[PDB]
Design a protein around this ligand. Structure first.
Ligand SMILES: NC(=O)c1ccc[n+]([C@@H]2O[C@H](COP(=O)([O-])OP(=O)(O)OC[C@H]3O[C@@H](n4cnc5c(N)ncnc54)[C@H](OP(=O)(O)O)[C@@H]3O)[C@@H](O)[C@H]2O)c1
Ligand SMILES: CC1=C(C=O)C(C)(C)CCC1
Length: 310
């Protein structure tokens, strides 16, 4: 019997990760920061799955609350005694929209094009301003929430769950990341060098990168300090997550710990734009959660590479 914990599972990709893992016979701990949303999600998913009540368990979990993190570990130890799969899916964007919310999607599409060009050898991300009558506002509070949810959350939950995962015969961690964490998009040369220097990577060095970023946005210095012009907190947080994925895979060599991009999928975070359904997106993290023993660890996989792994 295998047990999987999925964070941010009341909606979006995380909800579908729960569906797909439960369909594979894994006992799923569906977690969410809001109790009512998570209980309702469990009820809906249990109905749709049409399976026995024991297949899907709810527990509260806010990945930014250290008490909540500790209590979920106590719960798993008492009820199940081990954990086999951790999916760090919860995430936020750090952006507030003013006006036409579809500007958010315009930025995503611009960024995908920029990434493709940079991966093909171009040396700069083109400036971009949107067409529609909206704007993405990126303030300190949202940036802090993004880093704490998207980077410290997976780090702290991983750390809290090591003892339980160590009791699995095939421990798996999947970090739902983004191709926008690419160092090519990070702008900050110091941070790119630190995160890119894999042999010297430590948790302390990654923490320093994200804390320097937060101080800069607090002080209104994002441009002058060479951070991204937009999606700054998202990019920093996913880059940091990718780096922590490598750190953790090295520290816990018997585990398989990987980061993925699920693809651009219609969820609340994207204002329900993007080519993929939530069910399609969840195929990616589920693929890495079910990776056979001996498979890659410490890697970042975009969607098509993840799905081709086996
Ligand atoms: N959709 C895409 O195109 C896309 C692409 C690449 C990567 N991703 C990643 O996919 C992940 C899932 O996002 P989504 O697209 O499914 O968006 P979503 O529909 O907004 O779902 C986000 C989930 O994260 C939960 N969450 C936020 N803060 C949390 C916290 N502190 N503690 C616990 N749960 C928290 C949210 O709960 P509430 O309901 O309480 O807010 C929600 O359940 C994210 O990490 C995102 O970065 C998405
Ligand atoms: C990393 C990133 C996100 C989460 O994956 C979006 C899709 C919410 C906006 C673009 C930057």
């Amino acid at each position: 019997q295998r047990y999987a914990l999925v964070t941010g599972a009341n909606k979006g990709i995380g909800f579908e990760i729960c569906r797909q893992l439960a369909e594979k016979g894994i006992i799923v701990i569906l977690t969410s920061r809001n109790e009512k949303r998570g209980l309702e999600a469990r009820q809906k998913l249990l109905k749709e799955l049409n399976v026995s009540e024991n297949r899907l368990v709810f527990h509260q979990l806010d990945v930014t609350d250290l008490a909540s993190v500790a209590a979920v570990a106590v719960f798993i130890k008492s009820k199940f005694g081990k954990l086999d799969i951790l999916v760090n899916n919860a995430g936020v964007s750090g952006v507030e929209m003013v006006g036409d919310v579809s500007v958010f999607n315009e930025y995503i599409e611009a960024d995908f094009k920029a990434l493709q060009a940079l991966e093909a050898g171009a040396k700069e991300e083109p400036p971009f301003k949107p067409k529609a009558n909206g704007e993405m506002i990126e303030k300190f509070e949202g940036a802090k929430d993004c880093v704490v949810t998207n980077y410290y959350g997976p780090k702290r939950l991983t750390q809290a769950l090591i003892p339980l995962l160590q009791l699995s015969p095939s421990p798996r961690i999947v970090n739902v990341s983004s191709s926008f964490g690419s160092l090519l998009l990070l702008w900050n040369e110091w941070a790119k060098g630190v995160l890119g220097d894999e042999d010297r990577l430590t948790e302390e060095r990654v923490d320093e990168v994200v804390e320097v970023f937060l101080k800069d946005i607090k002080e209104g210095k994002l441009e002058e300090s060479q951070w991204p012009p937009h999606f700054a907190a998202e990019r920093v947080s996913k880059a940091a997550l990718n780096a922590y994925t490598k750190i953790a895979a090295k520290k816990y060599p018997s585990f398989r710990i990987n980061a993925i991009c699920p693809g651009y999928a219609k969820t609340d975070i994207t204002f329900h734009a993007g080519p993929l359904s939530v069910a399609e997106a969840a195929q990616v993290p589920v693929k890495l959660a079910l990776l056979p023993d001996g498979g890659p660890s410490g890697c970042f996989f975009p969607r098509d590479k993840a799905l081709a792994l086996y």
